[PDB]
Symmetry: C10
Subunit: 75 residues, 10 copies
């Protein structure tokens, strides 16, 4: 049955091709997920930058306000 070994060769060609295509698709999808994640992270960092830089100033000012308030309250 040369027919059988031949058929096995053709079948394997097809299966190997399908597996290669699937692998490239999976890799593509993971790369795209990478890009989406990187973009989302960088976006979030850019968005929170100002509130994070204002933080220490707002804490300092709040504390000064409390000191003032309590001073006035006592007298």
């Amino acid at each position: 049955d040369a027919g059988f070994e031949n058929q096995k060769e053709l079948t394997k060609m097809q299966l190997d091709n399908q597996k290669e295509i699937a692998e490239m698709q999976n890799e593509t999808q993971k790369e795209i997920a990478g890009i989406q994640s990187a973009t989302s992270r960088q976006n979030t960092k850019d968005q929170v930058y100002a509130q994070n830089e204002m933080l220490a100033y707002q804490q300092k000012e709040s504390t000064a306000r409390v000191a003032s308030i309590m001073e006035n309250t006592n007298l």
Copy 2:
């Protein structure tokens, strides 16, 4: 039956290949969901950082205000 054992072999080869492809695809989908979840969680933490850090200060200032209100 040699011929039937042969057809059975080819069939099994195809079925194993299809199953392997499905498994790699499923694993890919789970890894992507993992990336999306980690990204979403970290974005959320980054976003709520400042309000969480202002918490204790806003509480102390509210308390001070209450003392002042009750005085007046």
Copy 3:
């Protein structure tokens, strides 16, 4: 009693079982991913409402104080 037919039936069952097994694995994967998405969304929500919820008792107290002063200054 048809050997050829029993053979065809066996091969057919192999393919159909494989297709079913693949379907089951895909469905399980989809359900697990939905579980991940759910867990993440819930934890995100908890993280977001944390500050809100923590300020609640203080805001109620301060509102009560404002009312105390308002009513005292009325009549």
Copy 4:
């Protein structure tokens, strides 16, 4: 005499049953996922409106006190 036909019929039937069962399983899976999404969305919403709803009665009473003051001074 129609044995070949009854055989082809049996095979076709096996395939069709299998397809219908797979569709049924996919459909049930989608329904279950929708239930999960709905439950999560409902609970998220409850968690979000909690603070609002707890402040409500205070905001109403403070408004009423303000009104009493305004009307005295009017």
Copy 5:
């Protein structure tokens, strides 16, 4: 004839199966849409509850302020 009646039965089996699968999918899609709609509606009700409940209070207060303002204004015109 015989082969044809046979063939027509096989064909009909496939067509009926495909139609049933399509109907099951349509019903499933509609059920899911019903769940999403009910959920969205209930979420919206929960969200607008507080502002709706503040409405009458804000209206009464605004009216009070208007009365006070207009009085304070009219006393000098």
Copy 6:
């Protein structure tokens, strides 16, 4: 052509089934879009209710504030 008319019959059975399936799918999609639209419209109405109900009060109060402000500046 007997066999050919039989062929046309089987073929048309297929074509009609496919057209019926497609028609029912299209109807389903339209119904779902109708539900989504109705839901979105009602959600929107519920959300803007308070806003809209406060409108006349806010306008009246604003006009009052303007009268007050202007009276005070044409005082001093």
Copy 7:
């Protein structure tokens, strides 16, 4: 061949049916896009209604405020 022209007829029936099904799907999707668009436009109008109705009042009140501020200054 007569067998040919017959086969061509069957083929044509199939192709025409596939084209018709596709066309009805396209029309369905366009109708749904039309519903989504109309719903989104009306939602947006409902949402911005209060904003837009308050606009003139906020403008007049700002103008009054500015006149007040200018009056209360002592210079120029």
Copy 8:
């Protein structure tokens, strides 16, 4: 083969039909994208209208505020 010529003819009919159906679907998706774009642009204009109309007024009021501020 005359049979081959006929076969090639049926094939071409099928391939052309598939290409036309694909073309019609693509045109449909693009028209829908056009509708979505036009809708989103108009929604955005409607939304920012009030903002943009308050601009000149807020700018004037800020300027007056500055004149008051530096006078004390």
Copy 9:
């Protein structure tokens, strides 16, 4: 040779060429739609931040005046 094969090869090439063309048409369509979505998103964003950006210079000027005033009213 095998003329039947040459025929078969031609038919197969017609089909493959067709499939590839259809795939290219779809890829190009998806890219054009991405272009439309991006241009729309960019213009929407510009329209949205217009007011913000136009108030910037006034808010900066006013803040600067406030700083100077604070310095003058500080002992």
Copy 10:
């Protein structure tokens, strides 16, 4: 077998075509992701421009107020 080598040529033609199609799809999807990313990044930059530009001003003003306040509580 010449017949086998022929079938092998047809098979390979089909498989190569399928691989080329998949590659073109993958490339297209990557390109679209790139457009979406560039767009989202530029949108974000446009959005945060104003608050970033106000930052230094708000910091200086905060410092001034704090100095004033602290001097006053003494």
